[PDB]
């Protein structure tokens, strides 16, 4: 249950931010994101061997997870004394979940 959990983790992560109230819980929050994000890389709950395989050696698949670690990477920096900046970005991350559905869609 590390896959169904990561989702709740990426989700339960963004909540600790807006509610972090302190830069300390922000690192800890995004620390768990960029962490499970690198784990969800090999994510395949629906099986990518039974739908659109794309073509980029699937590289384009991990790139979406690695690229994601790129925006979360710069935010992990704001964490880590820029909370409101990190928190506001959290709403940007919430939007990533939407663009991620275009990946999971």
Describe this entry's structure for a reader.
The structure is a monomer. It is built from 4 helices and no strands. It has 105 residues and is mainly alpha-helical. It has one domain: Cytochrome c/b562 (Four Helix Bundle (Hemerythrin (Met), subunit A), Up-down Bundle), CATH 1.20.120.10.
Q: Percentage of helical residues? A: over 70%
Distance between the first and last residues' Cα: 22 Å
CATH superfamily descriptor: Cytochrome c/b562
Total DSSP helices: 4
The Rg value, from CA coordinates, equals 14 Å
| Strand tally | 0
- The shape, in one word, is elongated
Task: List descriptors.
Four Helix Bundle (Hemerythrin (Met), subunit A), 72% helix, mainly alpha, 105 residues
Short description:
By secondary structure, the chain is mainly α. The chain has one domain: Cytochrome c/b562 (Four Helix Bundle (Hemerythrin (Met), subunit A)). The protein is 72% helix and 0% strand.
Task: Annotate the secondary structure layout.
Elements: H1 2-18, H2 23-40, H3 59-78, H4 83-103
